[PDB]
Design brief:
Structural class of chain A: mainly alpha
Radius of gyration of chain B: 25 Å
Strand content of chain B: under 5%
Number of domains of chain B: 2
Organism (chain B): Blastochloris viridis (Rhodopseudomonas viridis)
Largest sheet of chain A: 2 strands, antiparallel
Main location (chain B): membrane
Shape of chain B: globular
Oligomer: heterotetramer
Helix content of chain A: 25-40%
Function (chain B): The reaction center is a membrane-bound complex that mediates the initial photochemical event in the electron transfer process of photosynthesis.
Strand order of the largest sheet of chain B: 2-5
CATH superfamily of the largest domain in chain B: Photosystem II protein D1-like
Order of helices and strands of chain A: EEHHHHHHHHHHH
Family (chain B): Belongs to the reaction center PufL/M/PsbA/D family.
Bound molecules: bacteriochlorophyll B, bacteriopheophytin B, menaquinone-7, protoporphyrin IX containing FE, 15-cis-1,2-dihydroneurosporene, ubiquinone-2, lauryl dimethylamine-N-oxide, fe (ii) ion
Keywords (chain B): Bacteriochlorophyll, Chlorophyll, Chromophore, Electron transport, Iron, Magnesium, Membrane, Metal-binding, Photosynthesis, Reaction center, Transmembrane, Transmembrane helix, Transport
CATH class of the largest domain in chain B: Mainly Alpha
CATH topology of the largest domain in chain B: Photosynthetic Reaction Center, subunit M, domain 1
Number of strands of chain B: 5
CATH architecture of the largest domain in chain B: Up-down Bundle
Structural class of chain B: mainly alpha
Chains: A mainly alpha, B mainly alpha, C alpha+beta, D mainly alpha
Largest interface: B-D, 114 and 102 residues
Helix content of chain B: 40-55%
Order of helices and strands of chain B: EEEEEHHHHHHHHHH
């Protein structure tokens, strides 16, 4: 229960403020390797030939690609989402234009969703962007997802113990704790702040004195919001494998400017993008997904910071395939 | 090297002494037994112990309080004995999560917490009577009771006075190892960093000071134990070379000194000030200050630093940004 | 509008901030420091030609005399005039007052420096009920050594110079605290007993080591009026004796170590 | 100039170095060689703080701040304006603290009393070293130390804690906080007790040791006793930093995750997982 030195440390604030990352080399190496599994881009192909919109029958998203380019996309998709399953995971051996299998439908929504991410959320994913791999990391079901209830293990590739199962009520507190960096924070930040945009993350007053008319009785927000916020922050820190000072100068959390690091702004955009994704792409999918995938509330697995980041401040240590697969965005 | 200061080389035993109180003497239950090891670094005699109505009322209420809490914790782990023991630190009894203002909250959302707090309070009150009475009964000054009163007062402050002032129970401190601790951050975060609350600083000053005073007072006495320094009472009524040297040690060191009696007043005061200070800090928080940091900036106190990484504009204030 | 906000860009917290420091300093300077002065004041300094008058500052620093009504009759009022009547066998080593004094005779007997004792009451510290507080076991019948701990009675007392100096005759116990404070030993060579504060004793199984003083010096240890009683002043004379040994036991004990 | 009972104690000797040379007083202050070196270091230190401060922005005491160097300067010296001043002042602080302590030793010897005080004073000096010297050494850079500033340093503390999501969960911290609180309470109970005995109120008689013990046995069924509470005090006090030092040093060199996750060792024991 103790990691041996030395520790890698970065600086992210003015000298003397103790702001920065504290990384355990080994742990970083363990993750650098895991992410290095990112399949390399497939050799570029000649754009020769007409658009697949003419060639194939049921192509509603990659119709502008040429046949060769299109198949290259399909290979990449397979390699990122279902390498073990192969093409048949979404197709009918005898009818590639068939939509019989649900993964086909969802994959289409996912193609759009990805294109969206790389196009409408560049303020977050920047020029790195994302591909099916970023989330799926090689399996139809992304290792890190969320239901309207905390679930254990965080990585669904692992098998839960009895208490970890959402069925075991006596395991609720621990399920939650592990979603908030092991804190006893009695709040589920994901549903509260990431499932949709109904709640406000900020809770600190922007004035020195209490403004009359919002500072008494039922006018004021309950302290619980401060906890909820704290929780969301704990999980965000954990999801990126980093600490508060990576974005804040604890001297004044609520303050921006010199009190915040660029990353915080990015994080800000991350929250919006995650909400967009969940609300408009993932959440609805509960209609196309077999009841087998749904949660106890019939919800579809949704994304959060960890879904892509998986313990790293930059998904896959900033690896990118954007230039290699322009079909995934940005779309001009 | 006065080893007597480290532990008692030769322990002693003798008839169990007893001082009669103005009352309650017949209420001292228990048979004084001795502990050899205890006696090595303290007084070997354990017990008896005064009961009285206050003491009993105290246990009565305290227990009721503790029971309400555990049952709720137990209920959290669905009464699974193994998880209860496993997840103990993470379990707690929370104040209302929703906003009901000062309205009494539902049992499942603040109601139980409120009751536990009521019984804990009564329990504290009874024990205060105990700490007070015993003093009068034994014909002693009520100094301890007052210092203890400050402590009970502070608890009341973070417990219900503050919540009352701003008008919301949700502000209360939850019962639980980790939980009552998580409150410290949620509370500080809400009021814009407690490090910028002058009273927080004052309180810390006295706490740290109590550390400095006991380390110093304690080391002082041991350093003059060879002369009887430990027999402080008669050192007061009749100054002896012990306290003379204790005094000269400090005067020659820091330029001024105290008396064997005054140093206790200093220490008493400091102790008291830790609680008094924090009570004020809490009474002021939420009531007349909403963000201690901005409050410091306003009064030109808060320090500022150059940016290291580029200053970052609040994304939410940029033109055409999502909500 | 703002809660706490007042007129001239000032708020409640800000006023309390000032009040706080006000109260603090008030208590610290006006109360505490006054109390720190109930002993040793008014200060002392050498006079010469004309200098006779109350001296303003000396009346302001002192607090009102408080009176302690003692548990076994009597009273003590502080602060008060408690000048060192004793003649000190000390002499100036140079000019200014900051100059240290020097023992002209034998510091241990003279009772100067570390060997100095306070002019405490020449009375026997009592127990909650008039009995002598500090008494030898030969009297403290119902008191005994805890089973498991050494019984120095009989064991020899070795001094700093390594050499038997006497035999532990008895143990003086505090009947109020149930704590052994002194060890009574027979001074080998000079028929007479002497007390030694336990604190100066390294209680072994076969011997009692006493590094404070040398074997010889054990003869000059102050004597008690009674044999089964001791007065506060005597406790000081006795304790003080050994303490002075720490610096005067030998010549080098007073010089610079490293 | 002298307390009424001070004359007889002002003898020569008890020094550690210098002998008669610096064995004298100046007002109530005993000098000694270490008193001298203390002044030297205090002088040097305050001077450096003034120059550094002046080369800085404001003069408001609450906002002044002398900071260590960026982490990139590692354990080497940094240019005065960017850490060197901090380095110099730190060394001065140390010279001053140690000098102050050794000076208490001389004073103790002269008075023929125990060196308990200066020993107790080592704890805080030790903790200072932990924060400024040792942890920085283990992490490999002076940049990890705390800045010398009335509010500045609170900020460093603040971010430091937050580098571990919730420093409250740090076991060394929990231990330490506990001792801070217990010690604070004990001093209140101790000081309170003494005063309660010598100051019963009205015309009441000053009480006794018997009454002391009777009080706590009556209240909590036990009484550690006179001399013992003083030993307990020094103990409780000293353990604020002694145990806390472990929580501080552990953070970073021996633990890089958040502190709440550390308790996973318990929460994740297989049999009840
Ligand atoms: C690990 C955590 C740290 C911490 C956490 C901390 C907190 C959380 C708080 C303080 C507070 C305070 N701190 Mg800091 N601190 C301070 C000094 C101070 C005081 C300004 C103030 C009250 C302390 C007190 O009452 O002491 C006990 C009692 C007495 C009587 C000490 C002497 C008097 C004292 C009031 C001030 C003495 C220091 C001077 C201002 C320095 C002047 C230097 C000049 C002479 C060269 C020093 C000198 C050091 C050293 C030498 O390392 C230090 C280290 C640290 N503090 C650690 C880095 N400190 C409180 C504050 O108000 O911040 C502004 C506060 O809220
Ligand atoms: C991230 C959050 C922060 C935080 C949040 C915080 C809050 C929210 C509050 C404090 C407060 C205080 N903090 Mg701060 N804090 C402190 C030090 C202190 C204390 C001096 C002071 C409270 C005094 C106390 O002893 O409470 C412990 C003593 C208590 C609680 C007394 C209890 C007495 C009672 C009679 C006991 C009863 C026992 C029982 C009978 C059991 C009953 C059981 C039931 C179930 C029956 C330091 C030294 C530091 C450092 C080094 O960083 C720091 C940093 C911070 N604090 C962070 C910035 N702090 C208080 C304050 O001063 O505010 C102005 C306060 O309200
Ligand atoms: C958000 C961050 C937090 C935090 C972060 C934190 C850190 C990062 C550290 C502590 C540490 C400590 N904290 Mg914590 N803290 C504490 C309490 C404590 C202390 C017990 C302990 C003391 C360390 C220290 O002061 O050395 C500093 C004091 C020193 C070095 C004294 C130096 C004195 C010097 C030798 C001489 C100075 C002389 C002057 C210059 C002379 C002036 C002359 C004039 C007067 C004539 C409480 C009670 C609370 C509450 C109630 O919430 C709390 C909350 C929190 N702390 C926050 C959660 N705290 C430390 C610890 O022990 O780790 C567990 C530590 O490293
Ligand atoms: C700066 C000054 C401070 C200060 C001062 C002072 N502090 C005092 C005094 C002064 C002056 C006293 O005179 C009084 C005392 O007496 O001292 C001997 C006391 C006290 N400070 C305690 C705890 C404390 N102080 C803290 C803090 C500070 N203190 C600050 C620092 C903290 C912190 C740090 O959190 C803690 C935890 C208690 C031990 C003690 C009485 C509590 C009580 O009121 O008891 C309440 C009574 C009970 C009977 C408990 C009931 C339940 C029991 C345990 C049984 C278990 C349940 C079980 C039976 C259920 C199942 C069985 C079934 C049959 C039912
Ligand atoms: C666990 C046990 C504890 C403990 C114990 C004891 N405490 C002692 C003794 C014992 C036993 C003494 O005998 C000695 C003393 O004589 O008492 C009267 C002393 C003393 N404890 C002081 C401060 C104190 N104790 C703290 C903490 C604890 N104490 C803990 C709690 C804290 C905290 C809480 O932060 C503070 C601030 C001084 C008042 C006093 C002289 C120090 C000195 O060194 O003189 C040396 C003299 C100087 C004039 C200062 C030199 C200034 C340098 C050169 C320049 C400044 C550098 C600096 C780093 C800048 C800071 C910036 C910013 C952070 C502001
Ligand atoms: C003139 C000159 C510059 C000359 C050169 C020589 C020289 C080296 C001089 C020293 C100059 C310096 C640096 C002075 C600074 C003095 C300092 C360090 C002051 C700090 C004072 C502070 C803030 C102390 C904190 C503790 C505090 C709140 C104390 C108040 C209560 C007192 C007086 C406590 C000490 C004290 C204790 C602890 C007892 O137990 C005890 C028991 C019995 C009798 C007396 C006492 C007693 O006096
Ligand atoms: C595996 C290497 C693989 C191949 C080969 C493949 C081919 C393929 C074709 C020829 C079509 C067009 C058929 C038509 O007329 O509509 C096509 C279309 C889609 N595919 Fe595919 N496909 C392979 C693998 C996969 C995998 C693993 C998935 C599901 C994750 C998948 C999905 C889809 C989707 C969706 C389309 C529609 C494209 C659009 O623009 O709407 N394929 N595939
Ligand atoms: C990239 C274009 C891409 C593809 C292709 C893709 C496919 C895909 C399928 C076929 C499923 C169905 C899995 C199942 O059978 O249950 C699916 C589901 C989810 N995906 Fe996906 N996905 C692509 C990209 C992305 C990206 C960038 C993310 C993460 C932001 C993401 C997330 C998810 C999630 C969550 C689901 C829902 C849970 C599930 O059905 O497994 N996908 N994806
Ligand atoms: C680490 C546990 C941590 C803390 C502590 C923390 C706190 C915090 C608070 C109190 C807020 C609300 C402040 C207000 O009311 O304005 C807040 C807000 C944001 N944070 Fe944070 N935060 C911690 C860590 C992190 C990390 C590691 C990042 C950056 C990757 C981050 C980011 C943000 C963002 C963005 C916001 C604003 C969100 C919004 O919707 O406006 N935080 N944080
Ligand atoms: C969830 C709300 C969330 C947070 C928080 C978050 C933060 C974040 C930061 C702080 C960065 C900047 C990293 C840096 O070191 O500069 C960053 C970068 C990227 N993110 Fe992110 N992120 C959150 C969620 C998500 C999700 C759901 C995805 C995948 C759809 C995702 C992706 C990315 C990508 C890509 C980057 C790369 C940017 C780069 O500089 O390389 N994030 N995120
Ligand atoms: C009158 C009306 C209408 C309503 C009531 C109003 C009223 C006065 C309410 C008061 C509320 C108050 C004062 C609330 C305060 C709550 C506070 C300060 C709680 C803080 C911490 C609680 C903690 C740590 C307790 C949690 C753990 C337990 C329940 C288990 C029991 C304790 C242990 C086993 C640990 C013992 C450790 C050691 C002492 C031996
Ligand atoms: C001379 O002074 C004192 C004693 O001697 C008679 C005591 O006996 C006690 C009481 C001590 C007890 C019960 C043990 C320690 C308690 C805690 C909470 C750590 C105190 C406070 C004291 O001041
Ligand atoms: C910041 C917390 C409160 C600190 C209070 C410090 C009191 C120090 C008392 C110094 C007394 C000085 N003297 C003798 C010159 O009066
Ligand atoms: Fe004392």
């Amino acid at each position: 229960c103790f990691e041996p030195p030395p520790a890698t440390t970065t600086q992210t604030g003015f000298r003397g403020l103790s702001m920065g990352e504290v990384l355990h080399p080994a742990t970083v190496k363990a993750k650098k390797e895991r992410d290095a599994q990112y399949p390399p881009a497939l050799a570029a192909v000649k754009a020769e030939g007409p658009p697949v919109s003419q060639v194939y029958k049921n192509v509603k998203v990659l119709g502008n690609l040429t046949e060769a380019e299109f198949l290259r996309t399909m290979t990449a998709i397979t390699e990122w989402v279902s390498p073990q399953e192969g093409c048949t995971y979404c197709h009918d051996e005898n009818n590639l234009a068939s939509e019989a299998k649900y993964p086909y439908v969802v994959a289409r929504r996912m193609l759009e969703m990805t294109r969206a991410i790389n196009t409408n959320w560049t303020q977050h994913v920047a020029q790195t962007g994302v591909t099916c791999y970023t989330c799926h990391r090689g399996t139809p079901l992304p290792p890190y997802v969320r239901y309207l209830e905390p679930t254990l293990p965080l990585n669904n590739r692992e098998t839960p113990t009895h208490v970890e199962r959402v069925e075991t009520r006596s395991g609720y507190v621990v399920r939650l704790a592990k979603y908030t960096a092991y804190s006893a924070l009695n709040y589920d930040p994901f549903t509260m702040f990431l499932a949709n945009d109904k709640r406000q993350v900020r809770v600190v007053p922007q004035t020195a004195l209490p403004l009359v008319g919002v500072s008494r009785g039922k006018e004021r927000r309950p302290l619980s919001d401060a906890y909820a916020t704290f929780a969301l922050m704990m999980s965000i820190s954990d999801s990126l494998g980093t600490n508060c000072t990576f974005c804040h100068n604890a001297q004044t959390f609520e303050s921006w400017g010199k009190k915040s690091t660029p990353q915080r702004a990015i994080a800000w955009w991350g929250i919006r993008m995650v909400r967009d994704l969940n609300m408009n792409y993932l959440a609805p999918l509960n209609a196309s997904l077999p009841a087998s995938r749904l949660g106890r509330q019939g919800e579809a697995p949704q994304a959060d910071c960890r879904t892509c980041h998986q313990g790293v401040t930059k998904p896959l240590f900033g690896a990118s395939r954007l230039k290699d697969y322009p079909e995934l965005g940005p779309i001009k | 090297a006065d080893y007597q200061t480290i532990y008692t080389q030769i322990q002693a035993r003798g008839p169990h002494i007893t001082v009669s109180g103005e009352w309650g003497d017949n209420d001292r239950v228990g048979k004084p037994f001795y502990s050899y090891w205890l006696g090595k670094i303290g007084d070997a005699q354990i017990g008896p112990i005064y009961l009285g109505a206050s003491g009993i009322a105290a246990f009565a209420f305290g227990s009721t309080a503790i029971l309400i809490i555990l049952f709720n914790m137990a209920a959290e782990v669905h009464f699974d004995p193994l998880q209860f023991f496993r997840q103990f630190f993470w379990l707690g009894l929370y104040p209302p999560k929703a906003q009901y203002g000062m309205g009494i909250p539902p049992l499942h959302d603040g109601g139980w917490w409120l009751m536990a707090g009521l019984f804990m309070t009564l329990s504290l009150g009874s024990w205060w009577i105990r700490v007070y009475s015993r003093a009068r009964a034994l014909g002693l000054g009520t100094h301890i009771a007052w210092n203890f009163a400050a402590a009970i007062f502070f608890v009341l402050c973070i417990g219900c006075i503050h919540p009352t002032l701003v008008g919301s129970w949700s502000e209360g401190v939850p019962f639980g190892i980790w939980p009552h601790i998580d409150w410290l951050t949620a509370f500080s975060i809400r009021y814009g960093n407690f490090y910028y609350c002058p009273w927080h600083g004052f309180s810390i000053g006295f706490a740290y000071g109590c550390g400095l005073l006991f380390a110093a007072h304690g080391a002082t006495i041991l350093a003059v134990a060879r002369f009887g320094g430990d027999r402080e009472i008669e050192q007061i009524t009749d100054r002896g070379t012990a306290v003379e040297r204790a005094a000269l040690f400090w005067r020659w060191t820091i330029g001024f000194n105290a008396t064997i009696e005054s140093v206790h007043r200093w220490g008493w005061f400091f102790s008291l000030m830790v609680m008094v200070s924090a009570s004020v800090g809490i009474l002021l928080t939420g009531t007349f200050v909403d963000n201690w940091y901005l409050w410091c900036v306003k009064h030109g106190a808060a320090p500022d630093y150059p940016a290291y990484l580029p200053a970052t504009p609040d994304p939410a204030s940029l033109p055409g940004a999502p909500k | 509008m703002y809660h706490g906000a007042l007129a001239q860009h000032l708020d409640i917290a800000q006023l309390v901030w000032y009040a706080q420091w006000l109260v603090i300093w008030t208590v610290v300077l006006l109360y505490l420091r006054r109390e720190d002065r109930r002993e040793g004041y008014p200060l002392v300094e050498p006079l010469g030609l004309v200098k006779l008058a109350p001296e303003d500052g000396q009346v302001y620093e002192l607090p009102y005399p408080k009176t302690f009504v003692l548990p076994h009759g009597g009273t003590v009022t502080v602060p008060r005039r408690r000048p060192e009547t004793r003649e000190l066998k000390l002499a100036q080593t140079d000019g200014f007052e900051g100059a240290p004094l020097q023992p002209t005779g034998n510091p241990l007997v003279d009772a100067v420096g570390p060997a100095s004792y306070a002019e405490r009451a020449e009375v026997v510290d009592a127990t909650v009920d008039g009995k002598a507080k500090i008494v030898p076991l030969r009297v403290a019948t119902d008191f005994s050594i805890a089973e498991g701990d050494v019984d120095p009675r009989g064991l020899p007392v070795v001094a700093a110079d390594g050499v038997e100096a006497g035999t532990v005759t008895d143990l003086w116990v505090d009947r109020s605290e149930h704590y052994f404070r002194y060890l009574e030993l027979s001074v080998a060579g000079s028929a007479r007993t002497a007390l030694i504060p336990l604190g100066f004793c390294d209680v072994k199984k076969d011997k009692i080591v006493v590094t404070s003083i040398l074997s010889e010096q054990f003869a000059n240890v102050p004597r008690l009026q009674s044999r089964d009683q001791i007065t506060l002043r005597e406790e000081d004379k006795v304790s003080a004796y050994y303490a002075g040994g720490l610096l005067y036991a030998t010549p080098e004990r007073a010089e610079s170590l490293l | 100039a002298l307390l009424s009972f001070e004359r007889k104690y002002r003898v020569r000797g008890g020094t550690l170095i210098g002998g008669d040379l610096f064995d004298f007083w100046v007002g109530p202050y005993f000098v000694g060689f270490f008193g001298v070196s203390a002044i030297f270091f205090i002088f040097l230190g305050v001077s450096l703080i003034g120059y550094a401060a002046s080369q800085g922005p404001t003069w408001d005491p609450f906002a002044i701040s002398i900071n260590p160097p960026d982490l990139k300067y590692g354990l080497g010296a940094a240019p005065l304006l960017e850490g060197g001043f901090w380095q110099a002042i730190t060394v001065c602080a140390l010279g001053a603290f140690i000098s102050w302590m050794l000076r208490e030793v001389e004073i103790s010897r002269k008075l023929g009393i125990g060196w308990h005080v200066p020993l107790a004073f080592c704890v805080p000096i030790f903790m200072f070293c932990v924060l400024q010297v040792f942890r920085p050494l283990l992490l490999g850079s002076w940049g990890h130390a705390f800045p010398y500033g009335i509010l500045s340093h609170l900020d460093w503390v603040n971010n430091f804690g937050y580098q571990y999501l919730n420093w409250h969960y740090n076991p060394g911290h929990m231990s330490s906080v506990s001792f801070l609180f217990v010690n604070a309470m004990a001093l209140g109970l101790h000081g309170g007790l003494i005063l309660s005995v010598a100051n019963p109120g009205d015309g009441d008689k000053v009480k006794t040791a018997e009454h002391e013990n009777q009080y706590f046995r009556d209240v909590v069924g036990y009484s550690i006793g006179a001399l013992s509470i003083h030993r307990l005090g020094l103990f409780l006090a000293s353990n604020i930093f002694l145990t806390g030092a472990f929580g501080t040093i552990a953070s970073g060199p021996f633990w890089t995750r958040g502190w709440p996750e550390w308790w996973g060792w318990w929460l994740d024991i297989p049999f009840w997982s």
